[PDB]
Structures are given as C-alpha cells and as structure tokens.
Write a protein that binds this DNA or RNA. Structure first.
Lengths: 46, 271
RNA sequence: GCUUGAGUCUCGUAGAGGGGGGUAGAAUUCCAGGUGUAGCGGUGAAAUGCGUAGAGAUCUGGAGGAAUACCGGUGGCGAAG
RNA sequence: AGGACCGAACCGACUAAUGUCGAAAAAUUAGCGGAUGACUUGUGGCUGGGGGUGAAAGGCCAAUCAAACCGGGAGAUAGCU
RNA sequence: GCUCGCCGGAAGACCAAGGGUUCCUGUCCAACGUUAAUCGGGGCAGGGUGAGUCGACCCCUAAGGCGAGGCCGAAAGGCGUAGUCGAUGGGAAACAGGUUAAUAUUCCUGUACUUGGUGUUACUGCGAAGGGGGGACGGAGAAGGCUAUGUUGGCCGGGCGACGGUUGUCCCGGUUUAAGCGUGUAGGCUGGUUUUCCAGGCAAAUCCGGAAAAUCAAGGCUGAGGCGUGAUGACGAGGCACUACGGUGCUGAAGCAACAAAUGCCCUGCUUCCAGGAAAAGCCUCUAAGCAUCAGGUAACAUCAAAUCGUACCCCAAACCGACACAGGUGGUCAGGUAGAGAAUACCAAGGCGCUUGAGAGAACUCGGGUGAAGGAACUAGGCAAAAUGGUGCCGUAACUUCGGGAGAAGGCACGCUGAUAUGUAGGUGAGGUCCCUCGCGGAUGGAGCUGAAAUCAGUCGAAGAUACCAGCUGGCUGCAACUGUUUAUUAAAAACACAGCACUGUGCAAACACGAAAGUGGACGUAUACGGUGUGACGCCUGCCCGGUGCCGGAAGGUUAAU
RNA sequence: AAUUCCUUGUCGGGUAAGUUCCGACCUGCACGAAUGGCGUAAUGAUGGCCAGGCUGUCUCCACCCGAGACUCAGUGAAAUUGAACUCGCUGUGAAGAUGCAGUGUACCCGCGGCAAGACGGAAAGACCCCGUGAACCUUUACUAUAGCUUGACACUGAACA
RNA sequence: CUUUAAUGUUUGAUGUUCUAACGUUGACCCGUAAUCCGGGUUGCGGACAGUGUCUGGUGGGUAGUUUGACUGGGGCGGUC
RNA sequence: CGCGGGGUGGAGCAGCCUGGUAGCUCGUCGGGCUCAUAACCCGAAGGUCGUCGGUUCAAAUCCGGCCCCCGCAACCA
C-alpha cells in the first residue's frame, strides 16, 4: 500500500508555517501557550 | 439537420445531432473575448450551494450585449455561430462604422443580409427598436424590463414574447408560460422568433453528454440514507411520506412566489 | 408519305382543383367590472350538476380556437378519395 | 465516428491458495475487468464536526466515524464491577 | 581475477519531490546490520557542491488567498474594489572534448549566443497605468518529407587460430562529430501594393476595422532536415613506454555509400467532428497630457556588468512515506540487437547485481509444480481448483433482431527447411548518364546497387512444424438489470446506485432554491426549447377504478378567533 | 415467480434416479400497471441448470523435483503462566475430577510427531435480560425553536370619491 | 323604546391621485485607469416593499427527553 | 394457550347501545294483467330471537357456561 504521508515543504509550510499561524487571531492564541511551554518548534520551520 | 447515427454501439445508437453548415466552421472572434471561470457551484464560503454542476468542457465568455443602442446605424450580418453559453445560435453583425457585435440571431436571418437599429427602422426580422413603434399582435423577442437594462426575457432557443395591447403607458404582454405581465412601453426589443428552434428535438443519449456538459447526476433521495435526506431507509423500497424537498419544503405543488413588489405588474397568472 | 387517331402553338372561358401566406363577421366559452335576483339548466318525468361565497339573464371590454349562415342548385371541378 | 472489439504500461480488486504472533497494522502468486474514456494521474487551492462530501455505503474526513481529534468543564455520574 | 547464473521498457542510466553529508578517503570493531565481519549507508578525523547561457529568485497572470477606504455583523469577524501575491502556465540567451578519490550544459581549451548601462559618430522627432496585433491554445484520425538509431557492405588494423576444416562468399573490432552562422528545400498559410474618406476603438491616431477606386499578379511570413562552415580541430582501435603493480605520459590508420525506419521533429500543422476548446506581460506599433539648442529612438563600434540561492549522493529505493536495511506504494525523460504486429514475451548488448545466515539430511507432514494407467464429475454447497481451448490467411457461420449486430459463433484446411518460376518476384527506394531551364536544396528521363512480403510446383526431415515463452473453452434454456460505468479502501462489485429518456410541479429575474445572524454570492454574467425538487429508469405495447383519510392548491360568505 | 404459507402442489420434458431447473394448468396465505406491469437484441469477473470438450477433483492416490520441517554452528523472540512430586476408570460433589474416596496401572528423563482434555490462549460475550445508562433515526409521542406566513404598531405622508 | 331622516362632530374599512420618506442587482457623470461603494441628475415604482416589537397558525428542517413494573428469561397476554 | 365482534323467518340485514310496542327488500302460497311464463301490483302466513339457568315490573335486551365463524400466532439467538 501507501502510508498517508507524502511530504511537501511547500504544502506544509503554507498551512503550518510561521506566517500561517500569525495570519489569524487563533494562530497567535495557540502560539501563546507554545511560548509558555517554550517548545523550540514554535512553528515547524528551518 | 436532425439525424440519428446507425447503431455501431449502444450510446452512439441514441444520439440526436443538430448540424447546420450555415454555422461558422472556425473559431470565435478573438478580439471580443473575455475569460470565464467555471465556479463549480461554490459560494464565497466554498460550499456547493447548488447540485448538478461539475466538470463541463471549457466554456469561455463570448461577449453578447443586449442594449442595442447603435441608433441610426445600418448593419450587416457577417456570419453565424453557435455558443454553448446560450442554447440558440449567435449572429456576428458587422456595422457600417467599423464595429462588430455578437447578438441573437432570429429565424429567417441569413448571413450577408442587412439588419439595423435606431428609430428609423422597419418591421424586419432582426431590427431592434422601442416597443412604442411595434404594432399590435407582434411576435417579439429579447425584450427588456426597464429601458436601457439591455435584455431580460426570450433569450433561449425557439422563444418569443407575445405582445397583446398597448393601453396608456403599459403594454399588455403574454409570457411563454402564460403569465400576462406588464412593462413600460419604452423597452427596446427585436422583432422575430429566436432561431435554432430545432434544439429542442436534440436528445443526449449518453451519460457523457451530461457530464462533459457540466451536469452531475441526480441521486434519488429514497435511495439515500434517512440521516442525510428527508427520505431514505426502509428495507422494502417504500415512500410512505409526503413528497418534499431535501429541505422540508413540499414539492409537486407549492406556490413559492413571494416578492410582493412585482404583484402590481403581475396581472394574469399561469392557470 | 397522307389523314378522319393523337399531340402542340396563337386568342379567349368557367371553376369548392391543389399548396403557401394574411384577413373579416356572427356565434359559443372563459376572465374582469356595472345592474339585478331566487331560481337556472333538463326531460316523457325526475335527478346529478350550477346557485344566497350571489348563477342564469343583460350591457361593455378583452383574450382565443374551430368551422364558414343566407348565395347553394340530381350546380361546378377532378383520375379517385 | 464509436461511453467500439483484443490486449500491455496505467487504475482497480471478481475467484482460489499462501499468510493470520505473516514479508506486510489486507499483501504476494497464477488466472482476470476497463484501457480514446462518466478515463487515469502529478503539482497547486477551496469546501470542516451536527458541519463538509457523497454515480448514496449511513461509506469518507491522516491505520480512528450512526457523528474525528487536542485542551478544558471533569477527580462528570454510576442503585453497577 | 577466471568461470556460472539473473534482470535487461530493468533489479539500468539521469532529474523533480522529499530527505539532509547517507557521496569520497584514511582508520577502527564493543555498540548499528537478525550470522561471522580487517566489510559497509556504523564510530572518529579530513576533504568535496566553482554558473551571464541550468532551475529558482525575478517579470507577468490563472484557481484562489490577503485586501487601504467601503458594505455588514454583540466583540472576535465575514465578503469584496483598487491593488498586492501566487505555477503545474508563458517570457532572453551553450554545446562538444578532456580532467578528479568525490563535482562539472558551472572548471580548463576551442567555438558561439543574449538582455541592459555609460560613452562616440552619423541621422531621425519621441513619449503612458490608454488602443490595436501578437502571445493564444480542443479531441481523434490519416498522409508526405526526415532524424535519433540500427543493419549490410566498402575501407583500415589484427588474426588465419590449443579436436576435423579455415588466405577465403573467413572472423572480430572501429567506422564518432553539437550550439551557432550561411543557404533557407520539402511543406503549410495568405491576394499584395497605392490613393481617399469615416457617427468606430472612454479622447486622439499614420496602428487596426469598414466602404469605394487603382495597378499587377505575386510579394511576404513561416519552416524539421540535408548541404557547406564550425573542424589541415577534437576524438578515435591498436601500438609505443614506466609500475607506487591502482594508472599515467606519448602517438595515431579509416572516419563514407546504401537501405530500413520511430510514439521524436515540420505539427503552437491539415482534414473532420463535436462536448465549440485561459489570462497578463515580454515584443512590435499608434498617440494623449506634453517636451523639441534638449530629452529619447534606430544603426554601427569600444568597453563593462550579468548579482543571490540550490549544485555532493539517493531520486520505481537499506537514503521518500511505511516504527525496521520491510516481497508494497512514488511522477517525467531516454530506451539497442534477433524473433515477433507490438513498449507483450524469451534470450543477449550497455550497465548493475546473486538478494547480509550457511553447511548436511532428503522422514511424516506443508507449500510452489511436473507426470500419470482404465474411467471421465461418480467429488462437492457448486465443474471451485487444475487441465485444456489458445496464432495468421482463407473457407464457412444458426435462433433472433432495434436489421448495428449475433460472431473470431460453431466447426475446419494449410503451416518447418531447400531449390526453382527469378544467380531473391510483385512492390519500395534510387546514384550516374541525357535533355531543358524563369540556374537552384530544380523538373522530366533513366536505370546500377540495396532491401524485401507472398503465391505455386517439386523434394526432403521428424511421432509432433503457432512445435518454445506468448496465447479465448464452447453450445443451449432462463431470472434480473438495459448496456460503459460507480460503491461498502480493511470479509458483500450485485438484482443495489448511477444512466439517457419520460412525467408532474415549482420559477417571470432583486427568480425559485441554498450557504451565510448580515452584506454578498452560487444559480448565471443563464433567463421558460432555461433552471430547481421529486419519482421511475433504453427501446417496444400500454399505464385502469377511488378525492373517502392525509397532504397541497383555489374560493373565501359565515362560525370560532391573538395582539391592538 | 427474487412473490405461493400449506408443499417435494400438478402435468409434461430432461435423468436409471430430479426438494433445484424449463414450459404450462390457476386453488394469487399475501403480483400489479412510475414505490411502473409484461417482453427484450446487444451486454454481463452476475444467479440457477444441462450437455459436449478436457483434465487427479473423485473411485484411491503413486512417484519425483525444489522452499521448510530433522541435524549442526552462530543470533535469539512469542502469546501465556497461582503453585506442582502434572496416570486411567467408577462414584461422589458449586451438579462432566490430573489432585477426594475405592481401585487398577505405571522405571527416571528427552527427541520427532499427531491433536481428545487441562470446560486450553486471545476479545471484562457483539446474543438474552437488567440499568428509572448512552446514542442517533422516526412520527398524527410531550414541550420549544429555525424558517415561512398573517395582522396591529413604528419608519409612515398629503388630498378627494 | 323602536323604526328612520337632515346636520354638526368623532373614528374605521376600501377606490383613486400625487411627491418629498423609502426602495432602485434602470441609464449616465465625477471621485477614479476601479463590474464594490458614496454622492450628484434623471427615469421608474410607491407610503407599497423591507426590517424591528407583539402575536396566531404551520412546523422532525433543528434540539432536549419520555417511552412502567411484577413476570418460574423476554415478548404477546393478564393484572396492579 | 389469548383477545375483539357476531350468532335474529327460505336468504341478507334491523331492533340491543339507553329495557315494556318485533321492521325492510327479495322469496313462498294465491289472485289479476298477456294465449303462457317472467316482470309488475296487492293480501296473508312464516321469528322456540342457538340452548339452559339466574335475577330485577317481563328476557330479543343484563349476566354466566357450551358450540360455531373471521383476523392475528406457530415468536428472539
């Protein structure tokens, strides 16, 4: 068969990128707890 | 020309074609074209608001104005063509002043002849002028609602609006569906019935002649689940309810007329 | 070859011969409005139906369809219908 | 010309065996269906939880669907074990 | 290293995607590899990715996202204009050879090409978010001309050969060359040019569109390949010379004819049919507000710039996704020889590997199969599994039918090799010679060479000649569904769903319906031969009775009747 | 009959043999003319039956060739498991005994096998019931509501019949 | 008190006309090259339509739940 | 195994419900109309109200036994 993960940095980063989160009100809200937890991968990027 | 191909295979057996060499065997006039995005029945919120729409071959937007305000200007019908946007053939008219215009083509109109617009016109199959010059009992088409609006009714194949009386400022009209409705006598229309009238005798024959058109199958509600439609369920293929729409509205008899501001104009109903 | 067979041309006659496109008139129905009212219609008789939500009758206007009163005659035309 | 015929790459999964702690959290093998079409497919977008989508099975929505998932109400309640 | 076996439309050779040094070298074995391991994609140390011509960034748009004001909504926020972004789209320009442990259309040598800036000279009027043309396009089908490439032969080089022949119609190896420029064929398209006028292109216009005159018959556009040039250059088999025994330096013959022939090219063609087949910019050009001793544009010439990023390796897999070094899935390009219609299949070339447990044993049993006496479904839920029919040309071919089909129906014959007709035919291609000429990539004519079906006759070989891989079981009755198709991915592929047709009914456009608290949208930039809801499901003959109950619509006089 | 309960209905055909099949008789428990009826060429990885062909499916399997099973060396799991000195039968018993009693039998311990039991292993039975549990679906179950629709009032005025 | 009649006066239901509210996905202009929009002329309808408050009806399109127990197992039945 | 309704001249139905008086059509017998039958018109008769018991002013009526008919049942793994 085929596993459900055919990666694409363009497709990924366009929906889960830094600007993708800062695009909406909600993204900035979610990043709040992430900055509170201080997880290095705030937004999966370089 | 109507015809049915010999049965070399079921499907090509039930096709009814309407071909006519009068039509331009080439391409449309490029300098009068604007693109057209096929929407796929989606709204600004991307939800498919209306079913039975999907696919369809790449139909581009041919520009067809309907106002016909080239007054005092005689014209020449250059060539005849077909457009999937409408269901009746289009007439490519060549003006005297070096202008062109894609407009509706009547029945007795043959390319190469002469048509026109203006208030110096005659009762000819293709002349566009206000109705206040048009005689009682005329067979008109491409009529408007408000003068200058351009065009509202009788734009499909083999259609016509029957004008009865012209009392006062309002003109007594007879709609195709039998709805005698009023209008301001000063609307610009064109004399003659809409051509390509043999379009009605054309029957697909195949499912392809529906899908590449853009039509997407009408699944019967009773065949659906009870959870996703007012019908569905029952291990015996039974209806047992009152025939309604997928949204509770009673079908097969239910007057859905409600605007209240055109009732004055609506005189005699469709009985 | 001829001509009393038959056919053709020159000039006129009669006509519901056929096909296509417009139009007129009375009448019948329906829709709307004014007047008015308990019957209307029907049959050998009665009834179903229609009617007090106000018909029929009557006047006016309008929208339509089909057939062409009298002329009409064992008259006319056509191969027949 | 053909939702035309046969049959490969391609898409699919009717039949049987192997397998079932396997090679694999549904595959391999030998036969098959369609294969110029309502076709297949890459890249790239929009439609979303009582809503989306549906050639309509109550199937599909990241191996999870008669209502996905993360956190929080919530240490929910349990005449039950 | 010498043999064997394997794929060879791949288990090969290059890229995108996605990974992230897994590439190369030295060294090492505890731990990673299901075994050992001085081996490796493992540990440690070092090195490697070189661009004006590749891709991207860039320029300009599509689906669609964001979206100043604006409309709207408790707030959050939603839609949308101008604009601004976004390829799988389009838009300028490079190929060959050699070199490295690893990279090179990027380095070096040789040979070409593109867009801009400043400057110089000589001329000339230029100039927009505006207009026009171009860009710019569908599916299938058939044909002509070629190329990649391959084959035979000629020529050159070497050998003439460990068991019989082999100086001869013998054998093997090589026989390779681009970008660009010039020429500008085959082929395809279109009547050019000149004058005048104009309610047209938001304005204008010499550009385009239109209507009348005029002259003459071509001009122009576009265009694979061939031929010259590129190139007395490069490369090139084999020798000539030293071994760190891995390789390097040097030298260098022939280098073409002919035939066959792509899914590649002309073709972003042509014919035809229908379901009628993007956009903007670059480019060319006309001008507005205007500026003309200017500024700019055209042409020739010199010179300078062409930035940044990726560039290793894997890339149908031990390096991507699957927890694994996992019998699976992952797009595009190239793709030889013989047989064969064929990219099927079988065996080989190039190239890469034998799969990261082996060695003995050969019992029951299990699995992948071979063969099988007499019989031929007696097995069983059931002809399921196996077996078998299986190719080409031709002959012949029923019930039925919508007169297309049924059908390759069923059921049969000939098939190898050699010679001959004929030192390999019909056919195809085609040089030289000849003639002519509006002289070139020319037209007729002419026929060598090369390549190559098939038919007939005769002879012969074996049990068998489609001898292998490959490759339909058929006939009949009958239910249902029309048929192609779709679906429960992970037990149901069917009679279910879909289906074209048909019927009713709703809808007169700010249309019904639908998402959305609203705006706004889809419907449709369509409008009754149109669109929405529902039912049934090709075609053929037809589709009766009932308005009681329920639902819907019409009529509203009267009874009952909320708020006020 | 994809429909017919009774039932294997009845008659004829196919077979030596026919609960199925094919064609008909109508006694249609309970077909029915758009929740379409009846036929139907072509078509079908469709349901059923029969025949010919061909064969190991079968009467009844036999042999042989490979990948394992067996041996050796290296590597090294697994579900599961209260504890073990872990035999059969008869009977009894929380009711089918490896463990109690009676009695028979049996050296201790491995290997290759085969599968009757240890009510063997996996899944806190998916069946029935229960819980004043849950979950959606349904309608002429109860109560609200979206939407549609009516009227009064507001935005909303000025003149005559 | 009933039947009626002229008038003053106080409200209501309809018919018709008008233009200023309002509507305007009619034409046109400017902001502005801009199919949004605002305003400006005009044309076309018309105190309608539409929205708000109140209210009657309809109403499974939507939502929250009920839907008994005993019962020689349940259900049907019967009974309380 | 259960539940509901019915049982009335030769036939089909009334009346029952809510208690005193038993009706309609056809049929049977007969007369008439026509030459005859039929149809038609008129008169009369024809009902232990399935059977027995109880009880209240009577029993077709209210109730309790037995027999008979129609529909549903022969159910969940």
């Amino acid at each position: 068969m085929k596993r459900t993960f055919q990666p694409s940095v363009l497709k990924r980063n366009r929906s889960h990128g830094f600007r993708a989160r800062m695009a909406t009100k909600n993204g900035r809200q979610v990043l709040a707890r992430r900055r509170a937890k201080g997880r290095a991968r705030l937004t999966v990027s370089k | 020309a109507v015809v049915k191909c010999k049965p070399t295979s079921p499907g090509r057996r039930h096709v009814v074609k309407v071909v006519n060499p009068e039509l331009h065997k080439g391409k449309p006039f490029a300098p009068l074209l604007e693109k057209n995005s096929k929407s796929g029945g989606r709204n600004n919120n991307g939800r498919i608001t209306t079913r039975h729409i999907g696919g369809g071959h790449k139909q581009a937007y041919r520009i067809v104005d309907f106002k016909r305000n080239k007054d005092g200007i005689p014209a020449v019908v250059e060539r005849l063509e077909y457009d999937p946007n409408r269901s009746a053939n289009i007439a490519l008219v060549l003006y005297k002043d070096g202008e062109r215009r894609y407009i509706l083509a009547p029945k007795g109109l043959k390319a190469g002849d002469q048509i026109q617009s203006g208030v110096d016109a005659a009762i000819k199959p293709g002349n566009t002028l206000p109705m206040r010059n048009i005689p009682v009992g005329s067979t008109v088409h491409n009529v408007e609602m408000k003068p200058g609006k351009g065009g509202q009714l009788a734009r499909s194949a083999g259609t016509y609006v029957q004008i009865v009386a012209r009392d006062g400022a309002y003109v007594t009209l007879r709609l195709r569906s039998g709805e005698m409705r009023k209008v301001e006598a000063d609307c610009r229309a064109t004399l003659g019935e809409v051509g390509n009238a043999e379009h009605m005798l054309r029957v697909l024959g195949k499912a392809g002649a529906a899908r590449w058109r853009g039509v997407r199958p009408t699944v019967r509600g009773t065949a659906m689940n009870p959870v996703d439609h007012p019908h569905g369920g029952g291990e015996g293929r039974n209806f047992g309810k009152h025939p309604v729409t997928p949204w509770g509205v009673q079908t097969k008899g239910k007057k859905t007329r409600s605007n209240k501001r055109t009732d004055k104009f609506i005189v005699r109903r469709r009985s």
